[PDB]
Structure formats: C-alpha cells, structure tokens
C-alpha cells in the first residue's frame, strides 16, 4: 500500500483550547519540561537542555 493511510489538512484556529497546562516549577526552556525549583543548580541535567 501507500504509506499514507494517514492524511492531514490545516485549518484556521476556529476556537481556543486550554492546553496551557500551568507549571508552578521551572520550565526547561527548550523542552518545556516542568521541573521543581529544587532541581535548579542540582548538578544534574534534570531538564533536557
């Protein structure tokens, strides 16, 4: 078969969505992983970056 058993179309932003899950921790800027502030300066890459 064609591999494209999947197909996708773009849209306008008809409506907002509440995806903006609140991180109280630090946000690992490049990854967006939410890490607890106690893991800052931890000596360990607990972020990705």
């Amino acid at each position: 078969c064609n591999f494209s058993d999947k197909e996708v179309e773009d849209c306008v932003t008809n409506r907002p969505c509440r995806s903006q899950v609140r991180c109280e921790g630090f946000v690992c800027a490049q990854t967006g992983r939410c890490v607890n502030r106690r893991l800052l300066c931890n000596g360990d890459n607990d972020c990705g970056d």
Partner: protein, 57 residues
C-alpha cells in the same frame, strides 16, 4: 496587587493594637504559611468622652 487594609480604628483598639497578615501558599506541592505583623500605636481616648467642669467658671 491587593486591597489595602482600609479600616476604621474603632474605640476597642485603644491604646494599642497589633496587625498580623498571613496567607498559605501551596507552593509546587508543599504548603507554607507566610505571615508578618506590626504594632499599631493608637491615640489614648475614652469611649464615654466624659467631661466635667465648674459651670460658674
């Protein structure tokens, strides 16, 4: 920013009252009680406002 403490210093506060302000912040997961307080010096005044005088001064 937050509403100030806008309150009348009613007679019960004389001569002195103490203001303590507090909140609990849940943090990431662990709560902390945060508080501060100040001594408020109040004018010495009577509730009766009683006055006495010789009428034939």
């Amino acid at each position: 920013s937050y509403q100030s403490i806008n309150i009348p210093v009613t007679q019960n506060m004389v001569p002195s009252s103490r203001l303590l302000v507090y909140y609990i912040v849940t943090g990431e997961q662990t709560a902390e009680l945060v508080s501060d307080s100040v001594w408020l010096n109040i004018e010495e005044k009577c509730g009766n406002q009683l006055q006495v005088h010789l009428s034939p001064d």
